[PDB]
């Protein structure tokens, strides 16, 4: 068992399968429905725990049906929530998932304001306990309190560098690896080149960073020379949660290997069989699917 | 005390408030959220008890956290479940609603398929006991057997005719009073003109019919005229002013027997509720509607 703790937001996806998208007022009927957790790190943790991490996910959920179904949903996948600090009289976060024929989208996100952004209590967390701790750029003092108390234990820590309205360059900074996607990485440093954007996010961190680029597969730096992975070709299905579940799985292999070039084809891996599947956790394939799909 | 029945669906409001309706796909974010009971027989049944009579909710709910969710609101509320069917290993319905800054509002209802439209189970119970019986549309077999046997009781029958994929046309058949919506009317009868489309309705019943129309308020045929009752000019959220309307309109028909007094009571409390958030919160008593209805 490598120990992983995954820092973010858990968010409640509730999908209701309609005939067309709601255009104007009016009551209209879902055929279908179904309910699935969401939140990078929360996904990330699945992920983990489908590859035989034990996992902590550490976040924030309210006292309401929502929080409840979140945990309960964590624990069914393997991942636990005994550090996720629940609010007395708060609703958590949720998404209204309006899904058409096409497969088109209307998603109403409501961020609770309840969940409140001081991080202050994870000093009660003593993160020694844990080989790796990953965090979202989506619970931002979250990422810094998480990653300040683990640098502090001598822990590895792994960003998950999302595009995201505030600044990261204080989470990179803390980042011993800064996995960002191609909007996260623009967002970050204003440079729209991925190569020349990664040069400039190195200066922020003695650690390493990443850039996902799709089908395009996986860049980072080493040395200062930048190292390419491809993306292994495969029939995709659905790629929804590709990103969260790689940076789940990179956390697991840095943390067991230590090898870049490894833990980066690895992640491609995991990521790579999760799009040949239907939904983004349903897909996610467990060690054994994972070093099949890797001795082909 | 008058005696009231509820007939139809309970299903858990997720209200989603934001700028903009929906226009097109993609991400939009809630600037708020409230979570409610709502279904159009349960709501009627909260406003039926906040106005002082004694109200039965006839429906079925799942073995769920929602179930357990609905019936607990529902006693808080002052209103009695104990003729509602529980089904073992059940979901129960819940709806996602968007809500605009105006108050324009979108629907998505998710009914429960666990929960079975079988209501041969109302058999086994006594409509006697009632004054009125009040169905909403969205369980079909429901309000046909609770309006066969109210029929049969002599006990008056009051239908809440919203729009539903079903022809609500033998339920109207049994209706004393048949009270629509814009778009419940349309479907039944075709007419996009309400005017016209009351006079079609009017037609499947010995009884009388209504449309309520949100802020343009409501209409009926009395005496071979249409009426008009205006809506009270107030607006946070009109989510469930239609089912509230329905709980109001029947404890009114039940006290008074006086149509435009009736009509004009659940526009009062029905318009009272467009001032808070949610389906249940902003339901006025009869004290605080007669004081309203004063100014
Ligand atoms: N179509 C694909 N084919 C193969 N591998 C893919 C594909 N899409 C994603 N991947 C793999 O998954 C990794 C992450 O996907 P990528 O789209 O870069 O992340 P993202 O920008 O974080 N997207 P998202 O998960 O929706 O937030 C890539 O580096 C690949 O290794
Ligand atoms: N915006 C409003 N302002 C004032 N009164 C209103 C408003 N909306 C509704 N009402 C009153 O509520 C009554 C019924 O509401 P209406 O919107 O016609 O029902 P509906 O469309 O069936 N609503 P719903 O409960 O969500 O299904 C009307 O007859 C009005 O008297
Ligand atoms: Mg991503």
């Known amino acids: 068992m490598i120990r992983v703790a995954c820092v973010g937001i858990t968010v409640m ?33 699945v992920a983990a725990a489908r590859l035989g991490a034990q996992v902590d996910f550490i976040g924030r959920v309210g006292d309401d049906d929502t929080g409840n179904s979140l945990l309960a949903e964590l624990e069914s996948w393997g ?50 306990q844990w080989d790796v701790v990953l965090a979202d750029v989506r ?44 909007p996260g990485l623009a967002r970050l440093t204003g440079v729209k080149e991925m190569a020349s954007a990664l040069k400039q996010a190195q200066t922020l961190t003695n ?19 930048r190292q390419h992975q491809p993306a292994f ?11 969260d579940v790689f940076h789940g799985a990179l956390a697991v292999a840095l943390a067991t ?13 995991v990521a790579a069989l999760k799009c040949t599947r239907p939904g983004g956790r349903a897909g996610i394939p467990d060690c054994d699917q994972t070093r099949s799909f890797l001795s082909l």
């Open 79 to 128: 991942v636990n929530t005994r550090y996720t600090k629940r609010y007395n009289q708060a609703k958590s976060s949720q998404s209204a998932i309006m899904v058409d024929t096409k497969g088109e989208r209307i998603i109403i996100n409501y961020p609770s304001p309840d969940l409140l952004p001081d991080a202050e209590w994870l000093e009660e967390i003593d993160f020694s």
């Open 233 to 243: 070709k495969v029939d995709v299905v659905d790629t929804t949660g590709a990103g």
């Open 207 to 225: 650690g390493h960073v990443y850039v996902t680029q799709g089908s395009a597969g996986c860049d980072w730096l080493e040395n200062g020379g």
């Open 139 to 182: 619970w931002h003092d979250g990422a810094k309190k998480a990653f300040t108390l683990a640098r502090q234990a001598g822990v590895m820590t792994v960003l998950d560098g999302d595009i995201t309205p505030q600044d990261i360059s204080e989470l990179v900074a803390l980042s011993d690896h800064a996995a960002f996607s191609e």
């Open 13 to 45: 996806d509730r999908i209701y399968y309609v005939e067309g998208l709601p255009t104007e007022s009016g009551k209209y009927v879902a055929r279908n429905y179904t309910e699935v957790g969401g939140g990078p790190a929360a996904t990330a943790a």
């Open 257 to 269: 290997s230590g090898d870049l070039a490894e833990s980066v084809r690895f992640a491609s891996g």
